[PDB]
C-alpha cells in the first residue's frame, strides 16, 4: 500500500482529498497513476521540466527516490510518501 499527502498547494490539485492505493510496490506506477489521476497540472506543479518549478519538495519512505532509483524505487505497505509545498508558495 502507498500513502500520499497534499498541502494547500496541492489542495486544489487533489481536491483536498487524500487516499491510499494498493496493488503495485513501486513509484513507477504510483507517479504514473497519480499523474493522470489529477492531471498534468499536478505533475508540472510538483515537477515542471523534470525539476521543481517553485520549490516543491516531496520525499518517499523518508528518502528521496533519486538517491538510488527514481520511479524504479521499490515501496512497501509500510513506505509512505509526503509532499511539501514551496518555501514561497506558488
What are the domain boundaries of the chain? 1-90
CB atoms within 10 A of CB 45: 20
User: Helix, strand, or coil here: 74?
Assistant: strand
Separation between Cα atoms, residue 14 and residue 72, nearest integer Å: 24
Cα(50)–Cα(53) distance, rounded to whole angstroms? 9
Q: How was this structure determined?
A: NMR
* Cβ(85)–Cβ(50) below 8 Å: no
- Whole-angstrom Cα Rg for the chain: 12
Name every residue whose Cβ is closer than 8 Å to that of residue 78 and which is 6 or more positions away in sequence.
Answer: 61
Give the span between the Cα atoms of 30 and 65, in whole angstroms. Answer: 12
Reduce the DSSP state of residue 32 to 3 states and report it.
helix
CATH class of 1-90: alpha beta
Amino acid at each position: 500500500m502507498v500513502t500520499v499527502r497534499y498541502y494547500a498547494t496541492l489542495r486544489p490539485i487533489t481536491k483536498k482529498k487524500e487516499e491510499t492505493f494498493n496493488g503495485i510496490s513501486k513509484i513507477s506506477e504510483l507517479l504514473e497513476r497519480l499523474k493522470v489521476e489529477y492531471g498534468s497540472e499536478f505533475t508540472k506543479q510538483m515537477y515542471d521540466g523534470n525539476n521543481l518549478f517553485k520549490n516543491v519538495i516531496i520525499l518517499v519512505n523518508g528518502n528521496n527516490i533519486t538517491s538510488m532509483k527514481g520511479l524504479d524505487t521499490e515501496i512497501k505497505d509500510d513506505d509512505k510518501i509526503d509532499l511539501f509545498p514551496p518555501v514561497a508558495g506558488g
